[PDB]
Structure 1
Amino acid sequence: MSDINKNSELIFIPAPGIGHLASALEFAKLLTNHDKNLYITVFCIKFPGMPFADSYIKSVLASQPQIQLIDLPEVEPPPQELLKSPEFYILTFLESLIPHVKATIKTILSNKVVGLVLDFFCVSMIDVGNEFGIPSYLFLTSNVGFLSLMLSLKNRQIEEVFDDSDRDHQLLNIPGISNQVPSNVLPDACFNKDGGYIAYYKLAERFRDTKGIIVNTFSDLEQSSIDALYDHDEKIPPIYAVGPLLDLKGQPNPKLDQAQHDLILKWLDEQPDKSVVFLCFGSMGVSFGPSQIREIALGLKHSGVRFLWSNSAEKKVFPEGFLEWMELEGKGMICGWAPQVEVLAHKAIGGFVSHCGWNSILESMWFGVPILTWPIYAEQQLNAFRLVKEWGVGLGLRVDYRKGSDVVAAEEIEKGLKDLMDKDSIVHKKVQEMKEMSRNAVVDGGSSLISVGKLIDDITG
């Protein structure tokens, strides 16, 4: 009787791709590690023309008796024309899977199922859960900063898209974020009149219908933001900080063979401690244009810093002689896909030019690597802004860069690199302190484990 009574089940419905999947799987593992009678079923969605399928997930899970996965049938992808807004495209694709989600839940339903854990983009699934009397929990792969922005959309109408006019000078007061936020660091979606704003609006609208909001962040980083949100609107469900949630091993990717993988780390072994700058801009596989790539190459070479540069640019694009020089001196290396967590863990890495995706930020924080910000899409500009202006752990190259921005010149890049690699940088002390705080969050008795315990109690009670 006691055993039956203790068994509980959660159904996870994460968004496609690493960046959304990694933390969600690590979360499923954290949960099961803290309740032997907690079982989880992960619905695996197939995104049109995209990797990170079963292979990746099973690799991450690496055997877990309390976690099983079920693939959802493939459905017709939405029209490409809707890509005028990635966010709206994603929302449309996910809502198209509602019928299959309902059908799959009906097939594995039992009376021990106590809830759904949904990604930000899958909140429409809340209604499906209600059909079965199953409550839903929001699992946010971003931070409390992004949550604050989404929760603020309630005070406005779905037709009032953010002004794309003078965002070069428009400070906004967003409850949750202490600093006035420059309008030019808001996500592209907020200004998108072709579905972007509508998508953000429609999703944020469902946030308050969840039984709880779980965030991949930690108390020492955003407790004041969480407190600020409550002090503003008590209608917000309970917020649980259970991070950092990271995949510290990394999983195999086709764009990186074992030989390539091994050589990168061995090359790093040969470099002086904290002398190498790592450059990586996410998992989307879309590089900067030719001119911009040339400017980065020249800036890197002119700075004299050693580097590991991950990019998918064609060889013909590089400045004449650059690649020859690079492999002649061996002062730098280029790869198509990097074993990021192993790189950030290496003693040779002294800096990280990042696109500021949240997982990449958490990883750099966990390893105490300083970041030179170069945001591009999603909420990366907001993350860059806070890293530089709020937490003071990063240096700004650009905090408002986005698709359509002008090319960043080699001279400006060279300047950022020198400041980043400066041993006497002021952010150095802050980064060291942030490393300690992120590590302590997840040890026994740390803020995140105390939080996960209470979350599990709330879920299964």
Structure 2
Amino acid sequence: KNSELIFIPAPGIGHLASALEFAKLLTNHDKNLYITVFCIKFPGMPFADSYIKSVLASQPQIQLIDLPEVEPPPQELLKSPEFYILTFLESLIPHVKATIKTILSNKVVGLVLDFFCVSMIDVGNEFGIPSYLFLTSNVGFLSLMLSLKNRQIEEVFDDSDRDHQLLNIPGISNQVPSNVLPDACFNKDGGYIAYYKLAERFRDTKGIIVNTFSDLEQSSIDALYDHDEKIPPIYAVGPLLDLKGQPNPKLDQAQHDLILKWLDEQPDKSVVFLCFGSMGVSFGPSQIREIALGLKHSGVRFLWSNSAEKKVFPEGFLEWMELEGKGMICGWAPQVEVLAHKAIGGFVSHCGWNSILESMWFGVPILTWPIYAEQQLNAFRLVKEWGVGLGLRVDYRKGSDVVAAEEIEKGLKDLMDKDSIVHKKVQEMKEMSRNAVVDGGSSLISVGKLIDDITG
């Protein structure tokens, strides 16, 4: 009674980890379920067969297969990250098809695709294999995507003309402003194209699985259904977290120890952790200097993760940290290990989905600073829907003016203020997020139904 699923995730951090965690989650709930993961090399850069294979504790039911590398797109499409990936992935079609045929057996029960790989549904179709969608984001994002059915092909959401006009999208309860919409929605350079080409097929999958939980978004899932029947079942099976923590870019831990030892010396819940995603979107010098001054004036202790050159900081800043020791800067960080630390009391996040889920898992309040993509949307809903985060910005993006130290300092104080409201809902979101994946929890129930539908 063996069943096999083919997993084709997208290259990255917030797209590969949760993918494997999902593989482990499923195989843990069906001894007879085996999974093949097609490891695809993101244009040259690592993050491939080193992490996807390391986390692979030889898990018997999870196999790894490397697809040969390919000539990335014309480095011209970089104008649009979205349109860049969509093209690179579509170029992997011949190989994808090729590889499936080579391992296809009457035991292959379906393909599990990342949102950016949803175009490959036509390959599975050729082999009579149903395809499932794996969204590393939330249901609100799905809705935004599922809401584009009422669009054209040449247009580009508001035609890049956004200001203060509200949009009504089935899925999110609150009216959604234009400024929280992802960058691709306005990217008339292939950005809107990609989101459209991809969202086109959502309703063509056998089921859509989402890295979220019921207590957090059942209301939207029910609204998506209630609003449309052509939509396949949705499976909330999250959170899907890598509580272990990606080893690299840490071959050893010389610095890994520095960060934790430093946090071990701070008063409980006094530190605010700032970190802005894996990509490492480095803010310009001005923004860095302003965030630095903001931090000093605020008086809060802090662990700031960034990739800015030392000379960029305001004069006196670095000395002041290494002397008064109220703060510290570092490059790549053990985010999960950090958020797990008891000294942490606040998080200035870019609002990537995982960062938000990990933060909720540990009951750490968030001061929002979205940057690229659906981050604004996450930020928007975080502050004005689930009330678990304070807003510094929710419409910020690559192009906005610099955020002044004054604003930052204010947000900082509000976020660390113990009597703020944000601290309340947070502990509740922690309970909920954690009761979601225990036996009897809403996500484990979903896993069973998903595995049942997959192998029935």
User: Could you tell me the TM-score, scaled by structure 2's length?
Assistant: 0.99
For residues 400-433 of structure 1, give each alpha carbon's deviation from its aligned partner in whole angstroms, at most 9, with x where no partner exists. 0000100000010000000000000101110010
CA distance in 1, matches of 2:320, 2:176: 43
SS of match in other structure, 1:54: coil
How do residues 99-138 of structure 1 correspond to structure 2 at under 5 angstroms? 99-138=94-133
> Quick check: 1:267 aligned with 2:269?
no
Shift of 1:54: 1.4
Shift of 1:249: 1.2
For residues 192-211 of structure 1, give each alpha carbon's deviation from its aligned partner in whole angstroms, at most 9, with x where no partner exists. 10000000000000111100
For residues 123-172 of structure 1, give each alpha carbon's deviation from its aligned partner in whole angstroms, at most 9, with x where no partner exists. 11110111111110000000000000000111111222112555221100
CA distance in 1, matches of 2:433, 2:386: 13
CA distance in 2, matches of 1:91, 1:24: 18
Q: Is the 8 A contact 1:303 1:418 kept in 2?
A: yes
CA distance in 1, matches of 2:411, 2:324: 23
Shift of 1:331: 1.1
Q: Is the 8 A contact 1:278 1:309 kept in 2?
A: yes
CA distance in 1, matches of 2:161, 2:13: 34
CA distance in 2, matches of 1:164, 1:292: 29
CA distance in 1, matches of 2:3, 2:120: 20
For residues 13-46 of structure 1, give each alpha carbon's deviation from its aligned partner in whole angstroms, at most 9, with x where no partner exists. 0000110011111000000000001000000000
For residues 65-84 of structure 1, give each alpha carbon's deviation from its aligned partner in whole angstroms, at most 9, with x where no partner exists. 00010001000000111011
CA distance in 2, matches of 1:19, 1:407: 26
Larger CA deviation: 235-244 vs 322-331: 322-331
How do residues 58-457 of structure 1 correspond to structure 2 at under 5 angstroms? 58-164=53-159, 166-254=161-249, 257-457=252-452
Q: Is the 8 A contact 2:436 2:443 kept in 1?
A: yes
Shift of 1:107: 1.1
Q: Is the 8 A contact 2:160 2:188 kept in 1?
A: no
CA distance in 2, matches of 1:321, 1:406: 25
Q: Is the 8 A contact 2:160 2:186 kept in 1?
A: no
CA distance in 2, matches of 1:360, 1:370: 12
Shift of 1:257: 4.2
User: 1:40–1:270: structure 2 CA closer, same or farther, 3 Å change rule?
Assistant: same
SS of match in other structure, 2:266: coil
Shift of 1:59: 2.3
Q: Is the 8 A contact 1:256 1:337 kept in 2?
A: no
Structure 1's consecutive aligned runs of 4 or more residues displaced over 6 angstroms after TM superposition are none
Q: Is the 8 A contact 1:255 1:336 kept in 2?
A: no
Q: Is the 8 A contact 1:275 1:349 kept in 2?
A: yes
RMSD over aligned Cα, in angstroms?
A: 0.9
For residues 174-232 of structure 1, give each alpha carbon's deviation from its aligned partner in whole angstroms, at most 9, with x where no partner exists. 00000000111000000110000000000000111100000000000000000000011
Q: Is the 8 A contact 1:256 1:338 kept in 2?
A: no
Question: Among residues 3, 7, 12, which one is paired with 1:8 in the alignment?
Answer: 3
Q: Is the 8 A contact 1:265 1:343 kept in 2?
A: yes
SS of match in other structure, 2:123: helix
CA distance in 2, matches of 1:417, 1:168: 27
User: 1:257–1:400: structure 2 CA closer, same or farther, 3 Å change rule?
Assistant: farther
Q: Is the 8 A contact 1:17 1:51 kept in 2?
A: no
Larger CA deviation: 54-63 vs 445-454: 54-63
CA distance in 1, matches of 2:181, 2:349: 18
CA distance in 2, matches of 1:256, 1:293: 28
For residues 353-375 of structure 1, give each alpha carbon's deviation from its aligned partner in whole angstroms, at most 9, with x where no partner exists. 00000000000000000000000
User: 1:173–1:358: structure 2 CA closer, same or farther, 3 Å change rule?
Assistant: same
What is the count of residue pairs matched by the alignment? 456
User: 1:268–1:290: structure 2 CA closer, same or farther, 3 Å change rule?
Assistant: same
SS of match in other structure, 2:282: coil
Q: Is the 8 A contact 1:29 1:61 kept in 2?
A: no
User: 1:9–1:98: structure 2 CA closer, same or farther, 3 Å change rule?
Assistant: same
CA distance in 2, matches of 1:119, 1:358: 15
Unaligned runs of 5+ residues in structure 2 are none
Shift of 1:256: 7.0
SS of match in other structure, 1:64: coil
CA distance in 2, matches of 1:325, 1:50: 36
CA distance in 2, matches of 1:189, 1:405: 16
Q: Is the 8 A contact 2:5 2:35 kept in 1?
A: yes
SS of match in other structure, 2:158: coil
User: Could you tell me the TM-score, scaled by structure 1's length?
Assistant: 0.98
Would you tell me which structure has more helix in proportion to its own residues? 1
Shift of 1:106: 1.1
Identity level (%): 100
User: 1:84–1:115: structure 2 CA closer, same or farther, 3 Å change rule?
Assistant: same
For residues 314-357 of structure 1, give each alpha carbon's deviation from its aligned partner in whole angstroms, at most 9, with x where no partner exists. 11111111111111111111111000000000100000000000
Q: Is the 8 A contact 2:250 2:256 kept in 1?
A: no
Partner of 1:30: 25
Q: Is the 8 A contact 1:256 1:336 kept in 2?
A: no
> Quick check: 1:460 aligned with 2:431?
no
CA distance in 2, matches of 1:261, 1:137: 38
Q: Is the 8 A contact 2:160 2:187 kept in 1?
A: no
CA distance in 1, matches of 2:28, 2:161: 50
Q: Is the 8 A contact 2:275 2:305 kept in 1?
A: yes
Q: Is the 8 A contact 1:190 1:196 kept in 2?
A: yes
